[PDB]
A paper describes a structure:
Toxin [name] secreted by some [name] strains through the type VII secretion system ([name]) specifically kills those strains lacking the antitoxin [name]. [name] is a toxin secreted in a [name] machinery-dependent manner by [name]. Here we report the structures of [name], the nuclease domain of [name] and their complex, which together reveal an inhibition mechanism that relies on significant conformational change of the toxin. The major contribution of this study is the discovery of an inhibitory mechanism in the toxin-antitoxin module that is based on a significant structural deformation of the toxin, where the central β-sheet of the nuclease domain of [name] is split by [name] into two fragments.
Numbering used by the authors:
A (entry chain A): 1 to 161
B (entry chain B): 470 to 502, 557 to 587, 592 to 614
């Protein structure tokens, strides 16, 4: 297999894992992953057909008949897939990514965005990252001043990299 | 692995690299359907100092190869999950 054939195999595996974590029909899924050697985070938002509303992933057990344990154990497998995606870069002697945007539609479109920002040494937290992500991806502002100011600190930080 | 290059695979997959030749973008119309702890505590404390509750902190542990922590917590009525390795 070529490098891009290995990447395609794991794209498909990541997409189908996310899809099986969603207990209703979805139209689009926006996934963000921050991963390095010491750990990381993976969240996603999905939409349903007929609406543009974003549905956060951990709200799935709170809204539907799926146990938190089953959901989290699936999340664990999903993380492993992204770590696999990351190890593929290591094996190609490529600098491994520290963030991966993973957006796909039910029709089969997939757009991926990798970045290499040293997030852990930036000392910005998980929610700060997520709020910055959400402001750039969608148009969403945080609503508290501490949160809003943290996004501004991350913006200035990145431009000056 | 070339710089500022776009390339398309036999299967239609489009790849874009940066000035260092790292993959930054991929297009696919073809889908078949100190550290981490410090990073985590620092943001928790900042939320508390701003008058926000950090609730329902739980951990799952795969013990002792690194020990694996699945950390979870809620802040704005929203549960977040995080993975931390100890090695």
């Amino acid at each position: 297999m070529t490098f891009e054939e290995k990447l395609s195999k794991i794209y498909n595996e990541i997409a189908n894992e996310i899809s099986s974590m969603i207990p209703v029909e979805w139209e689009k899924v926006y996934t963000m992953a921050y991963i390095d050697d010491g750990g990381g985070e993976v969240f996603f938002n999905y939409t349903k057909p007929g609406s543009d509303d974003l549905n956060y992933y951990t709200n799935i057990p709170k809204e539907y008949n799926i146990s938190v344990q089953v959901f989290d154990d699936l999340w664990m497998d999903l993380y492993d897939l992204f770590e696999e995606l990351r190890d593929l870069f290591k094996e190609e002697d490529l600098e491994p990514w520290t963030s991966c945007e993973f957006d796909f539609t039910r029709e089969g479109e997939l757009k991926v965005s990798f970045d290499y920002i040293d997030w852990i040494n930036s000392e910005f937290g998980q929610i700060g990252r997520q709020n910055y992500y959400k402001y750039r991806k969608f148009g969403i502002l945080p609503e508290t001043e501490y949160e809003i100011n943290k996004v501004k600190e991350i913006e200035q930080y990145i431009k000056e990299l | 692995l070339k710089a500022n290059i776009e390339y398309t695979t036999p299967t239609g997959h489009i790849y874009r690299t940066d000035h260092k030749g790292r993959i930054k973008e991929v297009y696919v119309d073809n889908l078949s359907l100190k550290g981490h702890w410090y990073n985590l505590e620092k943001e928790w404390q900042e939320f508390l100092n701003s008058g926000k509750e950090v609730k329902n902190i739980k951990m799952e542990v795969k013990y002792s190869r690194p020990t694996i922590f699945k950390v979870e917590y809620e802040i704005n009525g929203e549960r977040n999950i995080r993975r931390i390795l100890n090695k």
